[PDB]
From a paper:
In order to test our hypothesis about partial occupancy and ligand hydrolysis, we harnessed the D125 N variant of BcGH76. This is a variant of the catalytic acid/base which is inactive against unactivated glycosides, but which we reasoned would react with the 6‐epi‐manno‐cyclophellitol epoxides, even if at a reduced rate. Having shown that a trisaccharide inhibitor would bind successfully when the enzyme was inactive for normal hydrolysis, we then sought to study the binding of the trisaccharide 3, which we postulated would be non‐hydrolysable by virtue of containing a central carbacycle, to both WT and, as a control, D125 N enzymes. Compound 3 indeed bound to D125 N in an identical manner to 2, Figure 2B. As with reported complexes involving competitive inhibitors, interactions in the −3 and −2 subsites are mainly via hydrogen bonds with Trp172, Asn181, Asp228, Arg229, Asp239, and Tyr243. Probes 2 and 3, likely because of their enhanced active site affinity, do react to yield covalent adducts, data supporting the co‐crystal structure obtained from the complex of 3 and BcGH76‐D125 N. The difference in the efficiency of opening the epoxide in probes 2 and 3 by the catalytic nucleophile (D124) in the mutant enzymes, as opposed to the wild‐type, is likely caused by the absence of the catalytic acid‐base. We have previously found that mechanism‐based retaining exoglycosidase inhibitors may still react with mutant enzymes with the catalytic acid‐base substituted, even while such enzymes are catalytically inactive and ascribe this phenomenon to the enhanced intrinsic reactivity of an epoxide (or related electrophile) compared to an interglycosidic acetal linkage. This reasoning may in fact also explain the at a first glance counterintuitive result that inhibitor 2 reacts more efficiently with the acid‐base variants than 3 ‐ the opposite result from the experiments with the two wild‐type (with respect to the active site) enzymes.
GH76 enzymes catalyse the hydrolysis of α‐1,6‐mannans, such as those found in the yeast cell wall, with net retention of anomeric configuration. In 2015 their 3D structure and putative catalytic itinerary were identified revealing ‐ in the case of the Bacillus circulans enzyme ‐ five enzyme subsites “‐3 to +2” (using the described nomenclature) with Asp124 acting as catalytic nucleophile and Asp125 as catalytic acid/base in a classic Koshland double‐displacement reaction. We show, notably through mass spectrometry and high resolution 3‐D structural analyses, how the disaccharide cyclophellitol is indeed a poor inhibitor, but how the trisaccharide versions, in particular the carbasugar‐stabilised one, potently inhibit B. circulans GH76. We used a more easily crystallizable variant, R341Q, designed to prevent formation of an intermolecular salt bridge due to crystal packing and allow ligand complex formation, but which is otherwise unchanged in catalytic machinery and efficiency.
Numbering used by the authors: 39 to 352, 359 to 374
Amino acid sequence: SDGDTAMKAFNDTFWDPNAKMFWKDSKREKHQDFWVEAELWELVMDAYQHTSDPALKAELKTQIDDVYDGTVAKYGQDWTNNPFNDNIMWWAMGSARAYQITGNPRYLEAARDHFDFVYDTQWDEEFANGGIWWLNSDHNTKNACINFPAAQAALYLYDITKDEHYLNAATKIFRWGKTMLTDGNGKVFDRIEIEHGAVPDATHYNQGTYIGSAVGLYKATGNAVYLDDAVKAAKFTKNHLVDSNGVLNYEGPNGDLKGGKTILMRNLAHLQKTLDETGQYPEFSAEFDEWLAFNIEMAWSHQNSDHIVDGNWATYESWSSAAAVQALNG
Ligand SMILES: *[C@H]1[C@@H](O)[C@@H](O)[C@H](O)[C@@H](CO[C@H]2C[C@H](CO[C@H]3O[C@H](CO)[C@@H](O)[C@H](O)[C@@H]3O)[C@@H](O)[C@H](O)[C@@H]2O)[C@@H]1O
């Protein structure tokens, strides 16, 4: 399977079985940044779910536990001292996913405790009638990269616990974010700052977590408006965050944005599966599938002799390189 070759290659190149972390790059000098490591954790979980190679599956399943243990060995179990609410929420979401796959109670405790800290203490209605602050150290801006991943984490917690509190939280966060952090037509704004107001800079990862939270709200509530919201955001992405040949942008040099295609592809796959299951937006579904297959082909054609694909699809770094592996594990 294409997703097999890609994930095995990625592990061969970047996985450090000693530290139980990914290397940040092929110089193997530094391990990956904390939040990105949650995104590679999710990549291992997607490859686990995608593969039908029984041997590779059982190995990726041990690696789910290892990625957690390697990060907890370095940083500890309690991430609530991290000043970036997004750092905390990426790991809360990953932990919720690890609970769904493994049923290990440690992952539910990590997901729930870290989600509850952020939502309970960092949701605010004094500025802009709602939304979660970017930081817990300073309160100046409310950002797409915390609010939509928080809605996603709440949806996973809802699916796990069936505690309606988490569906209420997902709904409250998503509705606020669609109002204050999008143009209402599927373009997701980076953030809203107290002084300057909205910053209407769109990126792959914020498109992605808005699409994912919208699809998850559709799945939890059956309300087709949420699927309309996801489709609008996928249409924005495919017509704007692409080059003139329709290949998804390379978002360097910012290190956080370089691998954002990973988070976008993961969430576009959720949308593709939901359209395929529901028969919603059939015209768009056919166009969307053609455009995704084109992007995946383009990434595949960009692999080196070790079957690694740098993020510039049209020294290798694990975040930039992850996007092709995620694309083949949809
Ligand atoms: C939370 C956590 O993962 C931190 O480790 C990480 O440093 C934070 C980075 O987030 C900030 C930067 C993100 C990228 O910003 C750049 O691109 C934006 C979109 O084009 C521009 O608006 C911005 O000026 C800059 O060029 C940004 O997406 C995020 O909202 C933060 O501002 C992380 O949040």
